[PDB]
CSV table of C-alpha atoms and ligand atoms in Angstrom, one decimal:
chain,number,residue,atom,x,y,z
A,2,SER,CA,25.5,8.2,13.3
A,3,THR,CA,24.4,4.6,12.7
A,4,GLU,CA,24.8,1.8,15.1
A,5,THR,CA,24.6,-1.8,13.9
A,6,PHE,CA,23.1,-4.7,16.0
A,7,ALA,CA,23.0,-8.4,15.5
A,8,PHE,CA,19.7,-10.2,15.6
A,9,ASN,CA,19.4,-12.7,18.4
A,10,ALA,CA,20.1,-16.2,17.0
A,11,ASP,CA,16.6,-17.4,17.6
A,12,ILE,CA,15.1,-14.3,16.0
A,13,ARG,CA,17.5,-14.8,13.1
A,14,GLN,CA,16.2,-18.3,12.6
A,15,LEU,CA,12.6,-17.1,12.8
A,16,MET,CA,13.4,-14.5,10.1
A,17,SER,CA,15.1,-17.2,8.1
A,18,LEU,CA,12.0,-19.4,8.2
A,19,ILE,CA,9.7,-16.5,7.2
A,20,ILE,CA,11.9,-15.5,4.3
A,21,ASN,CA,12.2,-19.0,2.9
A,22,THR,CA,8.7,-20.3,3.5
A,23,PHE,CA,6.1,-21.0,0.8
A,24,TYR,CA,3.3,-20.3,3.2
A,25,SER,CA,0.6,-18.7,0.9
A,26,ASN,CA,-1.4,-16.8,3.6
A,27,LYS,CA,1.1,-13.9,3.5
A,28,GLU,CA,-1.7,-11.4,4.0
A,29,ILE,CA,-1.5,-12.0,7.8
A,30,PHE,CA,1.2,-9.4,8.1
A,31,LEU,CA,-1.5,-6.7,8.0
A,32,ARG,CA,-3.3,-8.1,11.0
A,33,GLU,CA,-0.1,-8.4,13.0
A,34,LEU,CA,1.0,-4.8,12.3
A,35,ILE,CA,-2.4,-3.3,13.0
A,36,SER,CA,-2.6,-5.2,16.3
A,37,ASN,CA,0.8,-3.9,17.3
A,38,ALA,CA,-0.4,-0.4,16.5
A,39,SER,CA,-3.5,-1.0,18.6
A,40,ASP,CA,-1.4,-2.2,21.5
A,41,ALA,CA,0.9,0.7,21.3
A,42,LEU,CA,-2.1,3.0,21.4
A,43,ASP,CA,-3.6,1.1,24.3
A,44,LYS,CA,-0.4,1.9,26.2
A,45,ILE,CA,-0.4,5.6,25.7
A,46,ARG,CA,-4.1,5.9,26.3
A,47,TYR,CA,-3.6,4.0,29.6
A,48,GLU,CA,-0.6,6.0,30.8
A,49,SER,CA,-2.3,9.3,29.9
A,50,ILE,CA,-5.6,8.7,31.7
A,51,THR,CA,-4.0,9.6,35.1
A,52,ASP,CA,-1.5,12.0,33.4
A,53,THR,CA,-2.9,14.0,30.5
A,54,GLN,CA,0.4,15.8,29.8
A,55,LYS,CA,1.8,12.6,28.2
A,56,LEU,CA,-0.4,13.4,25.2
A,57,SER,CA,1.0,16.9,24.5
A,58,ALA,CA,3.3,16.0,21.6
A,59,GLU,CA,0.3,14.4,19.7
A,60,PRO,CA,-3.2,14.8,21.2
A,61,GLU,CA,-5.1,12.5,18.8
A,62,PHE,CA,-5.0,8.6,18.7
A,63,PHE,CA,-4.9,7.2,15.2
A,64,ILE,CA,-3.8,4.5,12.8
A,65,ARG,CA,-3.1,5.5,9.3
A,66,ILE,CA,-2.4,3.2,6.3
A,67,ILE,CA,-0.5,4.7,3.3
A,68,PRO,CA,0.1,2.7,0.1
A,69,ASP,CA,2.6,4.3,-2.2
A,70,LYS,CA,2.6,3.1,-5.8
A,71,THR,CA,5.5,5.3,-6.8
A,72,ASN,CA,8.1,3.6,-4.6
A,73,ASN,CA,6.2,0.3,-3.8
A,74,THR,CA,5.9,0.9,-0.1
A,75,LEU,CA,3.1,0.3,2.3
A,76,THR,CA,3.2,2.3,5.5
A,77,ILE,CA,1.4,1.6,8.8
A,78,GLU,CA,1.6,4.7,11.1
A,79,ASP,CA,0.2,5.2,14.6
A,80,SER,CA,0.4,7.8,17.3
A,81,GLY,CA,0.9,5.1,20.0
A,82,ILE,CA,3.4,5.2,22.8
A,83,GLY,CA,6.4,4.9,20.5
A,84,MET,CA,9.8,3.3,21.2
A,85,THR,CA,13.0,4.9,22.6
A,86,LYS,CA,16.3,4.0,21.0
A,87,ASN,CA,16.7,1.3,23.7
A,88,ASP,CA,13.2,0.0,23.0
A,89,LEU,CA,14.0,-0.4,19.3
A,90,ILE,CA,17.2,-2.3,20.2
A,91,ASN,CA,15.5,-4.4,22.8
A,92,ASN,CA,12.1,-5.1,21.3
A,93,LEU,CA,13.0,-5.4,17.6
A,94,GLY,CA,15.9,-7.9,17.4
A,95,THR,CA,18.4,-8.5,20.2
A,96,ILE,CA,16.1,-10.3,22.6
A,97,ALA,CA,14.2,-13.5,21.9
A,98,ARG,CA,11.2,-13.9,24.2
A,99,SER,CA,9.8,-17.0,25.8
A,100,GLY,CA,7.0,-17.4,23.3
A,101,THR,CA,9.3,-16.9,20.3
A,102,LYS,CA,11.6,-19.7,21.5
A,103,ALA,CA,8.6,-22.0,22.1
A,104,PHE,CA,7.2,-21.2,18.6
A,105,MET,CA,10.5,-22.1,17.0
A,106,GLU,CA,10.9,-25.4,18.9
A,107,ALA,CA,7.3,-26.3,18.2
A,108,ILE,CA,7.4,-25.6,14.4
A,109,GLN,CA,10.8,-27.3,14.0
A,110,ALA,CA,9.4,-30.4,15.8
A,111,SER,CA,6.1,-30.5,13.9
A,112,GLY,CA,7.1,-28.9,10.5
A,113,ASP,CA,3.5,-27.6,10.6
A,114,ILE,CA,3.8,-24.2,8.8
A,115,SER,CA,0.2,-23.3,9.4
A,116,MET,CA,1.5,-22.4,12.8
A,117,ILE,CA,2.6,-19.1,11.3
A,118,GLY,CA,-1.1,-18.3,11.1
A,119,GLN,CA,-2.3,-20.1,14.2
A,120,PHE,CA,0.1,-18.6,16.6
A,121,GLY,CA,1.5,-15.7,14.7
A,122,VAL,CA,5.1,-14.4,14.1
A,123,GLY,CA,4.4,-10.8,15.2
A,124,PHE,CA,6.3,-8.0,13.7
A,125,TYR,CA,8.5,-10.2,11.6
A,126,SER,CA,5.5,-11.2,9.4
A,127,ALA,CA,6.4,-8.1,7.6
A,128,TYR,CA,9.1,-10.1,5.9
A,129,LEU,CA,6.5,-12.3,4.3
A,130,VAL,CA,5.7,-9.5,1.9
A,131,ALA,CA,8.6,-7.1,2.2
A,132,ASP,CA,12.3,-7.3,1.3
A,133,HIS,CA,13.2,-4.3,3.5
A,134,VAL,CA,11.6,-2.7,6.5
A,135,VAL,CA,12.0,0.7,8.1
A,136,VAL,CA,10.7,1.8,11.5
A,137,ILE,CA,10.6,5.4,12.5
A,138,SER,CA,9.6,5.8,16.2
A,139,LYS,CA,9.3,8.6,18.7
A,140,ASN,CA,8.6,8.0,22.4
A,141,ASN,CA,8.1,10.9,24.9
A,142,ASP,CA,11.3,9.9,26.7
A,143,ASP,CA,13.7,10.1,23.8
A,144,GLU,CA,14.4,11.6,20.4
A,145,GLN,CA,13.2,10.2,17.1
A,146,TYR,CA,15.1,7.1,15.8
A,147,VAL,CA,15.2,4.9,12.7
A,148,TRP,CA,15.4,1.2,12.8
A,149,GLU,CA,16.2,-0.6,9.5
A,150,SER,CA,16.8,-4.2,8.4
A,151,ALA,CA,16.9,-6.1,5.1
A,152,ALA,CA,17.0,-9.3,7.3
A,153,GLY,CA,20.7,-10.0,6.9
A,154,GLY,CA,21.5,-11.1,10.5
A,155,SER,CA,21.7,-7.5,11.5
A,156,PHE,CA,19.8,-4.2,11.8
A,157,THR,CA,20.8,-0.6,12.3
A,158,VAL,CA,19.4,2.1,14.6
A,159,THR,CA,20.1,5.8,13.7
A,160,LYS,CA,19.1,9.0,15.4
A,161,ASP,CA,16.6,10.5,12.9
A,162,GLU,CA,17.6,13.8,11.3
A,163,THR,CA,16.2,13.3,7.8
A,164,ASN,CA,12.6,12.4,8.3
A,165,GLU,CA,9.5,14.5,9.3
A,166,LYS,CA,9.0,14.5,13.1
A,167,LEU,CA,6.2,12.2,14.3
A,168,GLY,CA,5.6,14.0,17.6
A,169,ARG,CA,4.8,10.7,19.1
A,170,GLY,CA,4.2,7.2,17.6
A,171,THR,CA,5.6,4.8,15.1
A,172,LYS,CA,5.8,4.5,11.3
A,173,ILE,CA,6.4,1.1,9.8
A,174,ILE,CA,7.5,1.3,6.2
A,175,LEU,CA,7.3,-1.9,4.2
A,176,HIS,CA,9.2,-2.1,0.9
A,177,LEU,CA,7.1,-4.7,-0.8
A,178,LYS,CA,8.5,-7.6,-2.8
A,179,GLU,CA,7.9,-7.4,-6.6
A,180,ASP,CA,5.3,-10.1,-6.5
A,181,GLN,CA,3.4,-8.7,-3.5
A,182,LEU,CA,2.1,-5.4,-5.0
A,183,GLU,CA,-1.5,-6.4,-4.5
A,184,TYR,CA,-1.2,-5.0,-1.0
A,185,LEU,CA,-1.0,-1.5,-2.5
A,186,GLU,CA,-4.6,-1.9,-3.8
A,187,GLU,CA,-7.1,-0.1,-1.7
A,188,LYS,CA,-9.8,-2.8,-2.0
A,189,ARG,CA,-7.3,-5.4,-0.9
A,190,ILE,CA,-6.4,-3.3,2.1
A,191,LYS,CA,-9.9,-2.4,3.1
A,192,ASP,CA,-11.1,-6.0,3.0
A,193,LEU,CA,-8.1,-7.1,5.2
A,194,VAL,CA,-8.6,-4.3,7.7
A,195,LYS,CA,-12.4,-4.9,7.9
A,196,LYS,CA,-11.6,-8.6,8.7
A,197,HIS,CA,-9.4,-7.8,11.7
A,198,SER,CA,-10.5,-4.4,13.1
A,199,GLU,CA,-13.8,-5.0,14.8
A,200,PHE,CA,-12.3,-4.6,18.3
A,201,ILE,CA,-9.7,-1.9,17.6
A,202,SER,CA,-11.0,1.0,19.5
A,203,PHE,CA,-9.0,3.7,17.7
A,204,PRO,CA,-9.8,5.4,14.4
A,205,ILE,CA,-8.3,3.8,11.3
A,206,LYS,CA,-7.8,5.7,8.1
A,207,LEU,CA,-6.6,4.8,4.6
A,208,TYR,CA,-4.9,7.2,2.2
A,209,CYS,CA,-6.7,7.1,-1.1
A,210,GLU,CA,-6.8,8.9,-4.5
A,217,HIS,CA,-5.8,12.3,-2.7
A,218,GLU,CA,-7.9,11.9,0.5
A,219,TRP,CA,-8.3,10.0,3.8
A,220,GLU,CA,-10.9,7.3,4.0
A,221,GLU,CA,-12.4,6.2,7.4
A,222,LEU,CA,-12.3,2.4,7.8
A,223,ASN,CA,-14.1,2.4,11.2
B,301,ADP,N1,3.6,0.0,16.3
B,301,ADP,C1,4.4,-0.1,17.4
B,301,ADP,N2,4.5,0.8,18.4
B,301,ADP,C2,5.3,0.6,19.5
B,301,ADP,N3,5.9,-0.5,19.8
B,301,ADP,C3,5.9,-1.5,18.9
B,301,ADP,C4,5.1,-1.4,17.7
B,301,ADP,N4,5.2,-2.6,17.0
B,301,ADP,C5,6.0,-3.4,17.8
B,301,ADP,N5,6.4,-2.8,18.9
B,301,ADP,C6,7.3,-3.3,19.9
B,301,ADP,O1,7.9,-4.5,19.4
B,301,ADP,C7,7.6,-5.6,20.2
B,301,ADP,C8,7.6,-6.9,19.4
B,301,ADP,O2,6.5,-7.0,18.5
B,301,ADP,P1,5.9,-8.4,18.1
B,301,ADP,O3,7.0,-9.2,17.5
B,301,ADP,O4,4.6,-8.1,17.3
B,301,ADP,O5,5.5,-9.1,19.5
B,301,ADP,P2,4.1,-8.8,20.3
B,301,ADP,O6,3.1,-8.3,19.3
B,301,ADP,O7,3.8,-10.2,20.9
B,301,ADP,O8,4.6,-7.8,21.4
B,301,ADP,C9,6.2,-5.3,20.8
B,301,ADP,O9,6.0,-6.0,22.0
B,301,ADP,C10,6.3,-3.8,21.0
B,301,ADP,O10,6.9,-3.6,22.3
């Protein structure tokens, strides 16, 4: 059954800024999410080098990008370390980190919205292009859970019993805004990924039409 959580106030203000901004460089969400996937993969590769068993639920490292024109969603999937239920609650809303508070104080003092691009807003950049965001995650030390938020001051976390099992990793599902459908186009995606992927040392694949295309 679903549990509801309140966004930390600072995180709520960050989301508020993101949702109301006219910042035109929205495409940066893609680099933020792919970097997150790379970091999560970093972690499971690191943990498993001295302990190969940690790879058993999913032996291959990958990042997959799946645009879906039928329901206007863009999905970023990885087989990284994944998040436990507590991880989703702790890392995706309830706790405002040092950097986040510093970013908010800085941007409020300067009003310089180019900071969004210069310093980044991490995972929350998804709300630059999406109305609603879903996160399915599976970590070795817990069952599969689902995090959801339409950015209304709250999010929910629900033990997953409807979706296909990931084995290990994370699936970020962006429900794109009506005016942001360009990010379903494969050329748009490839050009963005090419721009930010030189030093991502995991295989990146794009779902095309259907077949998987290698981006690196
Ligand atoms: N794809 C992912 N797999 C596993 N954990 C993730 C993923 N994306 C985000 N997280 C967790 O959410 C946290 C917050 O993400 P973010 O706001 O991008 O900050 P940062 O990238 O600086 O960690 C990350 O530190 C990470 O712990």
